[PDB]
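so i finally got all the pieces together for this one. its six components total, 1422 residues if u count the protein bits. some of the lines might not be protein, just check the labels. i wanna see the whole assembly predicted at once instead of chain by chain like last time, that was a mess tbh
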Amino acid sequence: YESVTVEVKDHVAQVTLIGGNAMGPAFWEEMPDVFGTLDDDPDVRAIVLTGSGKNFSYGLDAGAKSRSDFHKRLQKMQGAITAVADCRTPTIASVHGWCIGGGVDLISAVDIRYASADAKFSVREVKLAIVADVGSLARLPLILSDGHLRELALTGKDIDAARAEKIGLVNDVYDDAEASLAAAHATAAEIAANPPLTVAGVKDVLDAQRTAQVAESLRYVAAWNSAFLPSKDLAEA
Amino acid sequence: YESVTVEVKDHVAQVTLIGGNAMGPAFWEEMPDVFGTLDDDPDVRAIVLTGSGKNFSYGLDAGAKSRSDFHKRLQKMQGAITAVADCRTPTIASVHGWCIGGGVDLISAVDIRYASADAKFSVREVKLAIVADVGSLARLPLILSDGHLRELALTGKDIDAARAEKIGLVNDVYDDAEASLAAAHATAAEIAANPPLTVAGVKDVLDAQRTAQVAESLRYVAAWNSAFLPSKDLAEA
Amino acid sequence: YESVTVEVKDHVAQVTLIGGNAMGPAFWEEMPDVFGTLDDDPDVRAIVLTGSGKNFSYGLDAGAKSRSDFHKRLQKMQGAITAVADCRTPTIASVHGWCIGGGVDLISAVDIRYASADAKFSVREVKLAIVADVGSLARLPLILSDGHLRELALTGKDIDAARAEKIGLVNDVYDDAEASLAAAHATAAEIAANPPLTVAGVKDVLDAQRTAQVAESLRYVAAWNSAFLPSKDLAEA
Amino acid sequence: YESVTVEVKDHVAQVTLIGGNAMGPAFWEEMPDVFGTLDDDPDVRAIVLTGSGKNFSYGLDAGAKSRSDFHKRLQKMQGAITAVADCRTPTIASVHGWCIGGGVDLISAVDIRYASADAKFSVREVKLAIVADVGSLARLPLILSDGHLRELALTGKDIDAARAEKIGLVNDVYDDAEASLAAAHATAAEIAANPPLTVAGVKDVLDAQRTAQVAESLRYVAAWNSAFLPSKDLAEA
Amino acid sequence: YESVTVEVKDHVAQVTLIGGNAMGPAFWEEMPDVFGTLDDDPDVRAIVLTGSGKNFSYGLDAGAKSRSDFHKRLQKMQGAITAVADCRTPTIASVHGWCIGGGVDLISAVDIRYASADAKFSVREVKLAIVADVGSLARLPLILSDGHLRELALTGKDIDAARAEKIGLVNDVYDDAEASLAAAHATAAEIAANPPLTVAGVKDVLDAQRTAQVAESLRYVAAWNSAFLPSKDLAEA
Amino acid sequence: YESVTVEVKDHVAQVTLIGGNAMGPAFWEEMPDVFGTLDDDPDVRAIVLTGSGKNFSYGLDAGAKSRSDFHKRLQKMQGAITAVADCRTPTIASVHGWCIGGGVDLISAVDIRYASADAKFSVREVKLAIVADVGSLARLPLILSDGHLRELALTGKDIDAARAEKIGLVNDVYDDAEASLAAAHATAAEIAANPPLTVAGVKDVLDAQRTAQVAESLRYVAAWNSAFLPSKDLAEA
């Protein structure tokens, strides 16, 4: 693969994103294949997801006929993330550094989130004159509450790891990158020491409770952005 | 009023549309006031709705900033049609002649439908390069079934009163234009001889079963039409 | 049992109601016990339901503290009718004569309905100044369509077996009572020659599709009738 | 393609199934690819579906680790039919002869159904000691009503084209197998003479109204059959 | 306006309630018009809501025919509160002092809530022998969790700003009234520097996720209170 | 009773479970009658629930015909917890010591939860090769959030009272057992001094918001466990 690295050891695979880890066309083309490959063979029972370098990611790098094609690309981009959100092997994210835009759309589709002390988070589509349509606003309501989500989505500001700990976006915070990565690996091993059919069944039962809302919200946002996205304020900044 | 006539006699009001009865800008501004006035005073217990002349009706007479205004403008036409479907006084429609497009969107919001032998029906928006967004496809699934509705909406053909009787679009068919109007008045007078407070409660209980899906379908169709409506095929015919 | 008779033969039980078959306190008291007894033992694989005599049935024979008791009574009667609709043994009804009010609430909970040529049907609560709250308006929407149901519920009139067959309320019509009872027994015997677990599973899968809306509608109508039922027009007739 | 034939001529493609017309592993493997190919190129605007020969089709030809593989295989076979039910090019079926079991699961996923006078239909899974789990019971509720569906699914009998016309399973009935195949082509050409970008939008809006309940019913039936299917009565016949 | 004051300066309007700020008939009559005026002007991009004096607010100041008028009268208060929650201009509340009864119902319909150290909150209808029916129990479940909501609604006690901040009712707490009002103005000015169409679209997408449940809960509570509200315990205190 | 003790004083009944309080067949046979008795008589207005000894509880301790009996038995076990979750008298739990497995399923169905400093909580079904199907994963999502729920359910670890306080599983923590029991009694006495028909109405309105999803999740988990529960890994530990 030209956008990630995969290394498996002792029933846990680690998956690293190498690209400031910007997500381009190769990302959207490749993620479903990587996660389908990892979720098939029985040698893997849990996955750890981390980013290369000193950050996690920076985000993303007319008439009806031209807008239909935009609609189709937007749907494919949505499917690339729904691929990770519907896998039956548990995933743990380990976040160090910066996490902007599309990266936030990615860590809202994993099961567990660990951070370090120098981590910063934002949802910065509104500052670009964009209404986010990849999965942030469809899946963040199960993680956060109304007021914190509304402030984050309407202001476009940055928050640190202590506030993200307090509002519920991450489970734990540690001093450095290596401590958080070790904690994530310890939890992954703890999960991999259980029976695998029972784990997949728990995941199935929990996922059966939330699919319709996410699908409906994604449909509506694709239509809205196909209507109102391209404008002058998109070029004004 | 500049678009209808109202005449009340012995607890039933008759409401006639006078414009071939095409529905223009005055229609969408005037209908909610007429139906709010009729549904308030206690002297009226049922309404009869018919069209003037020899027909019922003939139907309807860029950047983000203009499409926003188009969106807000579509929503208020939707609300004008929703006004009739939410009042608590029963309505009976008596259909004579031709009934094309928007008129079909109007008779799908009344309680009872009667016809005569010279009546013709169509949903002819697809032939205009339009996806209908005023209420037909959101309310028509409770009246018809999947195959009949799907053929009508995808072909754009005309059907006669016998087939409309068979498929469930009208309740009864009669020989001439005056027998149907007499039958509609007989049924309205039958309804107006029951306790007025039980009838509105039956309407309330029956309407509580169907509002959410209609509202959701209306939202989605407004968003779709704000994006894909203006095209070359709209000008091609 | 002081309100029914039960006789089982060759894996089919026949259940007759002996009271013009009007149903009173014993009906609601003891129906769930009868149907729970019949749906337990393996010797019974289908049930036939018919009414004694020349008809099927004729129907039913302040401050907050007094209205709470009415609310609980209404819920109890609703549960007595819901008992029949939730058993896993199929039931076939055979209707001769008259079917008024609560009887219509009863035959909308069986799987199959057969009639004869001398049969008459009505939903007559509106003429009593009542909004029906035992299960007719919650379950008739899956049997009929919107316009026929609205006419029946708002007018309060009687219809005969030909119109009932046309609109979908019954499956077949026959010349006399004995022919219809024989047809019902033939179909019940046809169902009782299939594997029993497969039949109960088909029933379970089909019932899992409709329970929530029925329960919601029943809740709302109980609250509405506790608020608005006792009035002067109730005593005016 | 070892299970179908495809021939396109003047914006309509005809797709014939050649295997009686039993549906085996090649069918489930190949069905999504044909419809993916036909929905891609713009040279095709409507599809006609018919069966080879003198009939339409005849149907289909432990511990936890053993049941899991069955569960996955059942899901894949469900997806093969959901592929046809979710394409944006309209399809018309033309039915001559016999239509048994899985074939009924196939014609409930097309838009329009035409028949001839020698056509016979059944849902025969219950006679095999099977609860159908490919799409019949999840999609037939939008086509039929409660009583007719319940009789068909619980008895396992066969019906002719007149009763299927009257209950709503087909739109029209013709005298021979060659008149229906020409009526279907006339309708397909009528659809293909409309603007191609409005037809797909109408389909999209109509499909947004029904997907969640179908998906839920399919999930539940897969879980039920993974538990109760393998038994003695399956081997007893 | 006789119940509020409005002053706009640099794209933010401040709206103050002047009545201990108790809300009466003028409040319910005039509430929708103020927000209709403010949400339509293009010179306003965010709103700040604060209460006059040393507190925020103190709350609110038979046969079927009288119950009907009570029912229609309750629905208008519900609509007056729903007007604020459906506008497309963001609102920030700033709470100093006391917040009792209907005051809690009002601040559960804004986007963001800020408090000071001398603030006290309660839901006190249960101590009046009332089940709250103006919007608290329908919208408060998205803000809080199950146990905290149940304790607050069943006991009727007062809580201070520290516990409210912990349980998620407010975002931030400050030392005095002026600090909180300055913080609210800073956040409003931060929101008013983003593109306005993007902000309104984010609001629309987020609101499309919650409307049906709120509407259903409001219907049910109106019916329940029309049935059971007037009693002796209402006069006993 | 052979599994609990009941003692009523000053309008509050205390209910103690005496079996390390393991829950056996007598528990599932007896709980519905115990709770039905207390919710009927008017002398009781609130209930306190605590466990005997030094802990709260330790939890609980083929072909289609055997699976069917297992399925019915699982449903009967679910009904005993649903009995507690659906009564109209408020309940307060007071937790001391250990709380493993089924005990957690019991405390996710009460209104309020109090703890002491030596309390420990877990969901250990996954470590037994079981997917929990008695009501934990169906009701626990209204109490917690996604990440904490997924960690608890997928790892099978123990947590202490401080972390349970932080994540929202309990409302308050106290130093010893007697302090928590006294706090629970003080709150119950506070609740029992309000009007009794307003408290039950608040409970009814709040419960109308959540029943359908709980019922659906329970159905699905019963089917899944009937399919995949008995295996070798169940005997491997």
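Strands of chain E lie at 4-8, 12-17, 46-51, 91-95, 98-100, 112-116, 120-122, 159-160, 172-174.
Chain E has ten helices and nine strands.
anyway lmk what u think
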